[PDB]
Scaffold this active site. Structure first.
Site, short mmCIF file in Angstrom:
data_model
loop_
_atom_site.label_atom_id
_atom_site.label_comp_id
_atom_site.label_asym_id
_atom_site.label_seq_id
_atom_site.Cartn_x
_atom_site.Cartn_y
_atom_site.Cartn_z
N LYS A 109 0.52 -0.92 0.14
CA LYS A 109 -0.06 -0.28 0.06
C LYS A 109 0.67 1.33 0.09
O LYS A 109 0.56 2.16 -0.60
N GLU A 152 1.45 4.49 11.31
CA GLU A 152 2.20 4.26 10.33
C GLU A 152 3.26 4.06 10.79
O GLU A 152 3.79 4.98 11.61
N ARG A 153 4.07 3.09 10.46
CA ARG A 153 4.81 2.73 11.19
C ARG A 153 6.52 3.91 11.13
O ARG A 153 6.53 4.23 9.92
#
Lengths: 50, 56, 62, 469, 501
Positions: D157, D183-184
């Site tokens: 993604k 998000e990471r």
């Protein structure tokens, strides 16, 4: 016609913020004091009419 | 109207069956139908010749 | 009361907001000028066509 | 206001305060609890009366002692905006988490804002070439457009988004916003490094991009208004700076997800599949705040980590409501080795049409869809029987569909490294030409493998020569 | 000018009286307040919060009366007084809404300024009886041939448009409006459907595109667009069909015929789901509390073909439920299917197959009428159904590609041509006078021979040919609307004339 209508709307919003300025002016005045009396006597008149 | 012209044209097409080999007479007739329909679509497309000078 | 106060103050101190006609010009446009359609071209004009067609005319549709 | 309070309860990160004084707060106000952990920001979310609010807690929770002073800092949290926010990575409180030192700014604006009205709209959609054939063919992009990705579990993604950013946002000079919700951190470090390197962030210089990054670890409440913070940054650019805008959002499943977590705790009956009953209002609000106005037509790109790949789950379903294009990406199609991995019968755009991209384009796409749908239909017959037990006409169709499918395999640019194959980017004009020919089977006579993992028709031809060698 | 209008506005406010109701807000947050007091509260009444928020009250409890806010949370403050409007919800209803986009509370959101509504009405008006109905005899032609032929649409009839989301879900309905432009253009007032397009849960941009399309097709004039945008409140979304209904009922009552598209009720259901669960009402099946059926049924039954007494004014309904995954067993889809007088199943796979419009005709039914379509068209499409029915069986045999009986493959060959004939590009409807020939050609098997690829070519050319020569024939179909022997023969000759050549 489109700009004419736009100009009326523009005139209305300019005059709207000018109205806000008059509202701020009224709430400064000791009309702020005097209208409490007006509201008081109006409540006397209304509530006596109730 | 336009139909008088075209009925005589298509009658001429089935007559042209008997005398076929005029290859640009028929293209001209097809064109006469085309351009007749073009003026017809033009004249039917026709807007007013002016603004609504009363109201608008 | 407050209706009157606002009415008076507002109306008096500015009835309409100012306006600028100049600004309208950018946002509006006047009539666009005609193209002068004139007299159309003359169809199958000159004996250039006629001579061509008489000469061309020899094609019998068999 | 100095509404003193106590922390009556700390039931999770949905602290409840008892504002001692009967001075009233208001919903969506912000409060500062001052602790040796610095300020902690809470946001008033209910008044339960008796001057006992129930407050969402943005920053981390722990250490709290009941009977702890509150102070009301009022209203929505004020972010800092200006051109001097361009290039920063911003927390939610305006703090630079890329640590470029206190964000220089002009005007600092409340996180919450109204969604522009029906009258404020000025909706326009152009064509935007992504340099990706499958994207261009199936879902032509547009300026002001709303794009949606319904990809896997960041399986690419992120990769898809990065490629899009690499192409479109470095081909867009106007402002662009990256807001990365839950998000990471590593992705953020990679992105930041890449941005600084690719000069889109010139570190010393100015940036035509701004970035907001919200880490997954960060409490749910923070993630909820990470989005709202970003929307304010976007609004400032859109409105006050006036400049052309773009916006990227990933992972907006996290936005939904965060909301559902707090909802239960807040004391709201969590509707179907545990998702908040207020899911609709929030998704709607976000997508009506991001909206095309005469102020600016905001191109938005939304990336949904479809949860277990169920798109019928209410959160993907409600996303469909506010999108104009989707490019749902199937994890399965990734496994087949097709990169792009976008499902092609589940791609749509409002700008795919017979005059919006022309009849020729529309016909070309139609045939691709029809061919693939037939192929999908004959998957049963192919498997239970064989392809030699298929009709000759069908066998041609099948071979064509296999070729087309392989043609769709087109190496990634940013992930040219990650895939390990040099990226293949192809113009829209080139795409229409290429597919037209292939559909006419003019190049269907050359290896299926030649079509596999390459760009344009010319590239297929060249790879046929390579295969021949 | 603007000053004068303002001077009128300033003049327009002065004096008020004692408020005999009050109650003090307590709960607030969750956008649903619950206020303490209020005993004068008549149910469903509209209550003006002193913040300036108005919220109607749908839950009454001897503790705290649950007033559903239309307005913002932050504006409302705990302990505020609410003073009852004293009026159950009402909307202005009239003809001024013609050519107007309006939000749920009937405010012109297109900002074409005030509406010349001839009344206000209540949104809880109940469905007319058995006696107030009349027999249905009013055809409606969508310009999509398949709809008219397979699922003929009358007036006062409910046809549920069901199928996968945004597969031109909006577009199918818009096509109906466009062929209904022909009747609208037509001066027969009772054949002029004042079309009311209700848009629930949709974003302003989508709507803006829709209004652009409608204004482009200049159908906006007779169109009313009732909206409850994605932004707009969940109570307002619930209330939006019911107030749309009121506007429709004004036409219906007047004897005027009108048409109401309820797009999409699925988002209305979500709104009621939210609303109910934040009125703390127990979740129903799929979190839509049971009585949702009651809610929907009262709404839907107000589409009626009324008696000649009521001027024959028939509001016609087209509900739209965008079924996710075609899940019709979902509680709301099951419920609606029972209520509605037709179902118009659409299918995504058939869209991908290239059938556009993509109609799952097997489940598309219209349980009511055939005076819901033209008599002429009834005659021609009589065996369109039969051919197609045979085609369905035949297609199954054709699948697996087993060597078909020549007769079955005759059916298959005929059937295929019909399928290509049905397909139509969005925003292009077709006039019925010229849908009768195309179906005549197909049904009288003249197209069965003509090759599939050039069916599309043939179709276009056939229409051109009829415009040129047998335009007399078209005029007769228009004028008499039932195919006579002479017309059938004339048409047969014409069809032969262009099928051969």
């Amino acid at each position: 016609v489109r700009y004419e209508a736009s100009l009326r709307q523009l005139e209305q919003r300019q005059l709207a913020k000018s109205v806000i300025s008059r509202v701020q002016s009224e709430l400064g005045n000791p009309k702020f004091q005097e209208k409490v009396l007006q509201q008081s006597i109006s409540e006397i008149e209304q509530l006596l009419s109730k | 109207a336009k139909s008088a012209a075209n009925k005589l044209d298509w009658a001429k097409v089935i007559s042209s069956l008997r005398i076929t080999g005029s290859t640009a007479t028929q293209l001209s007739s097809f064109k006469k139908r085309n351009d007749e329909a073009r003026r017809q679509l033009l004249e039917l497309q026709s807007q007013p010749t002016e603004v609504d000078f009363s109201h608008y | 009361n407050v209706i009157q106060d606002l009415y008076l103050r507002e109306l008096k101190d500015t009835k309409l907001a100012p306006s600028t006609l100049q600004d309208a010009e950018g946002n509006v446009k006047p009539w666009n000028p005609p193209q002068k359609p004139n007299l159309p071209e003359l169809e199958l004009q000159g004996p250039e066509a006629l001579k061509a067609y008489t000469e061309q005319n020899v094609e019998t549709a068999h | 206001t100095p509404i003193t309070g106590k922390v009556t309860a700390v039931i999770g990160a949905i602290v409840d305060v008892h504002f001692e004084q009967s001075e009233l707060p208001a919903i969506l106000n912000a409060l500062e609890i001052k602790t040796p952990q610095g300020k902690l920001v809470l946001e008033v979310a209910q008044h339960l009366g008796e001057n006992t609010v129930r407050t969402i807690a943005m920053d981390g929770t722990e250490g709290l002692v009941r009977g702890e002073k509150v102070l009301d800092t009022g209203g929505p949290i004020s972010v800092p905006v200006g051109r001097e926010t361009l290039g920063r990575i911003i927390n939610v409180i305006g703090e630079p988490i890329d640590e470029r030192g206190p964000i220089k700014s002009k005007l600092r604006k409340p996180i919450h804002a109204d969604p522009p009205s029906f009258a404020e709209q000025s909706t326009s959609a152009e064509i935007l070439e992504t340099g990706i054939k499958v994207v261009d063919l199936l879902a032509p992009y547009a300026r002001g457009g709303k794009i949606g990705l319904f990809g896997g579990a960041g399986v690419g993604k992120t990769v898809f988004i990065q490629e899009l950013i690499n192409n479109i946002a470095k081909a867009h000079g106007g402002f662009s916003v990256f807001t990365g919700v839950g998000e990471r951190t590593r992705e953020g470090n990679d992105l930041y490094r890449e941005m600084k390197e690719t000069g889109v962030i010139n570190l010393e210089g100015e940036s035509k991009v701004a970035l907001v990054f919200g880490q997954m670890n960060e409490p749910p409440g923070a993630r909820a208004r990470v989005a709202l913070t970003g929307l304010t940054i976007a609004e400032y650019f859109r409105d006050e700076e006036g400049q052309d805008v773009l916006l990227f959002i990933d992972n907006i499943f996290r936005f939904t997800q965060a909301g559902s977590e707090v909802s239960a705790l807040l004391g709201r009956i969590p509707s179907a599949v545990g998702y908040q009953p207020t899911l609709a209002t929030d998704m709607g609000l976000l997508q009506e705040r991001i909206t095309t106005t005469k102020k600016g037509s905001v191109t938005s790109v939304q990336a949904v980590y479809v949860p277990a790949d169920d798109l019928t789950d209410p959160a993907p379903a409600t996303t469909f409501a506010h999108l104009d294009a989707t490019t749902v990406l199937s994890r399965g199609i990734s496994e087949l080795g097709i990169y792009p991995a976008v499902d092609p019968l589940d791609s749509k755009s409002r700008l795919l049409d017979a005059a919006v991209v022309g009849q020729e384009h529309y016909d070309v796409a139609s045939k691709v869809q029809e061919t693939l749908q037939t192929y999908k239909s004959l998957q049963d017959i192919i498997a239970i029987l064989g392809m030699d037990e298929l009709s000759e006409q069908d066998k041609l169709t099948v071979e064509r569909a296999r070729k087309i499918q392989r043609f769709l395999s087109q190496p990634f640019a940013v992930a040219e490294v990650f895939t390990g194959i040099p990226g293949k980017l192809v113009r829209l004009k080139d795409t229409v030409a290429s597919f037209k020919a292939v559909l006419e089977g003019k190049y269907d006579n050359i290896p299926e493998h030649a079509f596999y993992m390459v760009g344009g028709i010319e590239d297929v031809v060249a790879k046929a020569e390579k295969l021949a060698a | 000018e603007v000053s004068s209008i303002l001077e009128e506005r300033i003049k327009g406010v002065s004096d008020e009286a004692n408020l005999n109701e009050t109650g003090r807000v307590l709960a607030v947050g969750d956008g649903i307040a619950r206020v303490f007091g209020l005993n004068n509260i008549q149910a469903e009444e509209l209550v003006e919060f002193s913040s300036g928020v108005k919220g109607m009250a749908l839950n009454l409890e001897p503790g705290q009366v649950g007033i559903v806010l239309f307005g913002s949370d932050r504006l409302v403050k705990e302990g505020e007084l609410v003073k009852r409007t004293g009026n159950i919800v009402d909307v202005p209803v009239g003809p001024g809404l013609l050519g107007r986009v309006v939000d749920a509370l009937g405010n012109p959101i297109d900002g074409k300024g005030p509406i010349d509504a001839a009344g206000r009405s209540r949104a809880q008006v109940k469905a007319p009886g058995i006696l107030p109905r009349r027999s249905v005899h009013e055809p409606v032609q969508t310009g999509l041939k398949a709809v008219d032929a397979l699922v003929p649409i009358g007036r006062g009839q409910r046809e549920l448009i069901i199928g996968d989301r945004q597969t031109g879900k909006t577009a199918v309905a818009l096509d109906t409006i466009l062929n209904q432009k022909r009747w609208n253009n037509g001066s027969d007032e009772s054949k002029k459907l004042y079309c009311v397009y209700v848009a629930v849960g949709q974003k302003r941009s989508t709507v803006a595109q829709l209004v652009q399309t409608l204004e482009q097709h200049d159908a906006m004039k007779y169109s009313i667009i009732v909206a409850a945008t994605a932004s707009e409140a969940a109570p307002l979304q619930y209330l939006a069909p019911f107030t749309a209904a009121s506007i429709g009922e004004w036409f219906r009552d007047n004897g005027k015929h009108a048409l109401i598209v309820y797009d999409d009720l699925s988002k209305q259901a979500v709104a009621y789901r939210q609303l109910s669960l934040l009125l703390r009402r127990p979740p129903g099946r799929e979190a839509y509390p049971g009585d949702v059926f009651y809610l929907h049924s009262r709404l839907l039954e107000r589409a009626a073909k009324l008696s000649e007494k009521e001027g024959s004014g028939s509001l016609t309904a087209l509900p739209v439920i965008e079924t996710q995954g075609g899940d019709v067993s979902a509680y709301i889809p099951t419920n609606v299917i029972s209520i509605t007088d037709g179902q118009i199943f659409l299918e995504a796979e058939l869209f991908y197959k290239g059938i556009r419009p993509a109609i799952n005709v097997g489940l598309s039914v219209s349980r009511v009428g055939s005076a819901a379509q033209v008599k002429a068209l009834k005659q021609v499409a009589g065996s369109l159904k039969l051919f197609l029915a045979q085609y369905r069986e035949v297609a199954a045999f054709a699948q697996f590609g087993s060597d078909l009986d020549a007769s079955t493959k005759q059916t298959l060959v005929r059937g295929e041509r019909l399928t290509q004939l049905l397909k139509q590009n969005q925003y292009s409807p077709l006039a019925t006078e010229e849908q009768v020939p195309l179906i005549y050609a197909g049904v009288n098997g003249h197209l069965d021979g003509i090759e599939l690829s050039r069916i599309g070519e043939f179709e276009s050319s056939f229409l051109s040919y009829l415009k040129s020569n047998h335009n007399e024939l078209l005029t007769e179909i228009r004028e008499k609307g039932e195919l006579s022997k002479e017309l059938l023969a004339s048409l047969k000759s014409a069809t032969e004339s262009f099928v051969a050549t």
